[PDB]
Design a protein around this ligand. Structure first.
Ligand SMILES: [Fe+2]
Length: 178
């Protein structure tokens, strides 16, 4: 089971439950078609069960680590949180696993629709590259999740807009001509 809302027919007001009239919850299967993948494992069962590593092999993930979010335990909160706070696009994939804490991930559909997805402990989520997304969890102001990336940590130093790069940007222009 996955927790998410189809705000496509719901009011932008965050305070509201975003329950359309009639109301309709996100379709887990619908998102999978969108290219969204999620792993259900117990953080405690993750380390005790390298099986999660097996999933990495399928997604070609050689680098993995455990990251926790906290103002006091996460120096550089303003820039770090603001950097991923804004929605951006790029040719890189997004793999996040919530070992602990509560939060939600922002995803976009090809139909130009936005869905609010809630991330729970033990629930992992993957966002295909080339799709806009926004990660937030300020509601709890304390979330612990693992991140899986391939190659050198690009996030360490990256440009907001993916198109910013001629090679990673100019290439995108070719798609427009398609
Ligand atoms: Fe991203």
């Amino acid at each position: 089971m996955v927790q998410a809302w189809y705000m496509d027919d719901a009011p932008g007001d965050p305070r509201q439950p975003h329950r359309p009239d009639p109301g309709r919850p996100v379709g887990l299967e619908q998102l999978r078609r969108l290219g969204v993948l999620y792993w259900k494992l117990d953080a405690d069962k993750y380390e005790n069960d390298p099986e999660l590593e097996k999933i990495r092999r399928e997604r070609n993930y050689s680098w993995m680590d455990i990251i926790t979010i906290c103002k006091d335990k996460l120096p550089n909160y303003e820039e770090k949180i603001k950097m991923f706070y804004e929605e951006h696009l790029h040719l890189d994939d997004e793999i996040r696993y919530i070992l602990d804490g509560s939060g939600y991930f922002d995803v976009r559909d090809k139909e130009d629709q936005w869905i609010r997805i809630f991330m729970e402990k033990g629930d992992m989520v993957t966002l295909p590259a080339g799709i806009y997304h926004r990660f937030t969890v300020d509601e709890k102001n304390y979330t612990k999740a693992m991140r899986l990336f391939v190659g050198e940590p690009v996030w360490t130093a990256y440009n907001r807009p993916a198109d910013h790069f001629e090679a990673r940007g100019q290439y995108v222009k070719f798609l427009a001509q398609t």
